[PDB]
Structures are given as structure tokens and as C-alpha cells.
Amino acid sequence: EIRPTIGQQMETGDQRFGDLVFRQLAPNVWQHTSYLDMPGFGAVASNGLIVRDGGRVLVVDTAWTDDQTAQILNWIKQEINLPVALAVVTHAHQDKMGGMDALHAAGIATYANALSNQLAPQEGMVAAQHSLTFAANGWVEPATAPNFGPLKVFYPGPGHTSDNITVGIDGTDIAFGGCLIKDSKAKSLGNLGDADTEHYAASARAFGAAFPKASMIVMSHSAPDSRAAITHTARMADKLR
């Protein structure tokens, strides 16, 4: 059993598949979890999403590595057995974009914030194939996100990074904050090295206001939580200013 140093532990309802863990969150939504092993420190878990939208699958975030991301595709083939149409990746860091080459090799169309694509090489990441742009209110420009089905992509402003984006799943209780949101019991906002400490709190609140209905808040390094994760993240961020 994988017991992360950072990230949620395995609980009942989790399925181990190769080096990864999968958890069903709703009839057509699963959380993928992958682990980066740091010698002398242990494993760091990272979470993304898998969405079945009719007859295709949509992915939110890669795993840490190409091989782990290929394992996600293999899990999809074995458990869902539908074509993977596209992926949205939520900023240019390894936990979110480390497996882009695996998606590209499989013929999967990839999308990221234009800024993520611009930062990608500087951050050691392969850029997505397509760039999302955003209105001043944070909502994705519709023509840059064609055929996204239930995915509602929102740029909340600079926080964890300047490029961080978020994704709601229409028809479900779920909104995904990626690395921007930490859980309601976290005492740290994680790595603030690339963070905007002035604007973080407003960005966390903007995420909450963009997806006001969502009751299940999914994030990169904790199990899904209530909206208290948003409130708590914003309150920790208030202390940075």
C-alpha cells in the first residue's frame, strides 16, 4: 500500500491499479492519483480527474510522469473503454503537466492556459497543443475551448501560480481547484515559491464564486472536501498580505 508523506492516504473505495489509485466520485467522474517518490522523503500524491461525457473521456491534469500518465490511459481502456477526446491541464508544474508527451503520443488533444504554455519550457514541461484564453471575469473564451462537454474552465487569478486554472463539471457536485485549493484542515498553502501572495486570497474566493453550487471540492493533494476547503484556503491566504 502506498502511504504518502504528502497527500491523502488510501481509504475504502480506492482502487489500486499499477502504481496509481482511482476513486469514483460520481457516476461519470473519477479521481486519478499518482505518486512521486522522493528518496529519503517518501511519496507525494497528486490528484486529477477523469470524466466520461457521453461516449468519450475527458482528462483533467496529467500524472507526475509520462509512464504514470500512460497508466491512466490503460486504466481508462480497461475500466471505461471509450476514446479519450481531450485533456485540460491546470498549470505548468510537474504534478499537473509532467505526462504531456504520453497524451500526445496517444493522439489526445491537449489544452492549457496560454500562460501555462508560455511558461511550460521554462518549467521543464511540454506545452499543450492548444491555448485557452480568458475574459477579464476569469471565464474561458468559448472559441478556445470547443467541444468541452460539461467542463467549465475558470481562471481565478494568480494564486498558487500566475497561470493556475480551475474546472467545474456541469451536472455534478464537483469543482476542481488543482493546487490552488488546500483542504479545510491544512496548515500550509504548500509551495509558495511561484505564488502571488498579494492576490492569492482573492483568487481562492473567485474560484468559490465561479462555482457557487459545487459541494465536492477536489484538489491536487487532499481527498475531496466540502466548501470549507475554499474558505480555509482563502483565510490562510489572507495572512500572506
Ligand X SMILES: CC1(C)S[C@H]([C@H](NC(=O)[C@H](N)c2ccccc2)C(=O)O)N[C@H]1C(=O)O
The binder of 38, among ligand OH, ligand X, Zn ion, none, by C-beta within 5 to 8 A per type, is ligand X
- Spell out the residues 6+ positions from residue 95 whose beta carbon is closer than 8 angstroms to its own: 36, 44, 46, 61, 64, 179, 220
- Closest distance to ligand X from the beta carbon of 107 (Å): 26
164/172 with CB nearer ligand OH: 164
The binder of 36, among ligand OH, Zn ion, ligand X, none, by C-beta within 5 to 8 A per type, is ligand X
Under the binding rule (CB under 6 A), the answer on residue 6 touching ligand X is: yes
Q: How far is CA 202 from its chain centroid?
A: 19
- Closest distance to ligand X from the beta carbon of 91 (Å): 8
Q: Is residue 145 a contact partner of residue 132, using CB atoms and an 8 Å limit?
A: yes
Scan residues 32-61 and list those touching ligand X (CB under 6 A): 36, 38, 44
Is residue 221 a known part of a binding site? yes
Beta partners for 31? 23, 49
**Integer angstrom CA distances of residue 52 from 79, 99, 128, 169, 185:** 11, 20, 21, 11, 30
Residue 47 burial class via C-beta count within 10 angstroms: exposed 0-12, middle 13-18, buried 19 and up: buried
Q: Which of 23, 32, 52, 93 binds ligand X (CB under 6 A)?
A: 93
Q: Which residues bind ligand OH (CB under 6 A)?
A: 93, 95-96, 179
Is residue 182 a known part of a binding site? yes
Is residue 191 a known part of a binding site? yes
In the chain the first and final C-alpha atoms are separated, in Å, by: 40
Q: Which residues bind Zn ion (CB under 5 A)?
A: 93, 95, 179, 220
Annotated binding site for substrate: 182, 191
Would you tell me which residues interact with ligand X (CB under 6 A)?
Answer: 6, 36, 38, 44, 93-95, 179, 190-191, 220-221
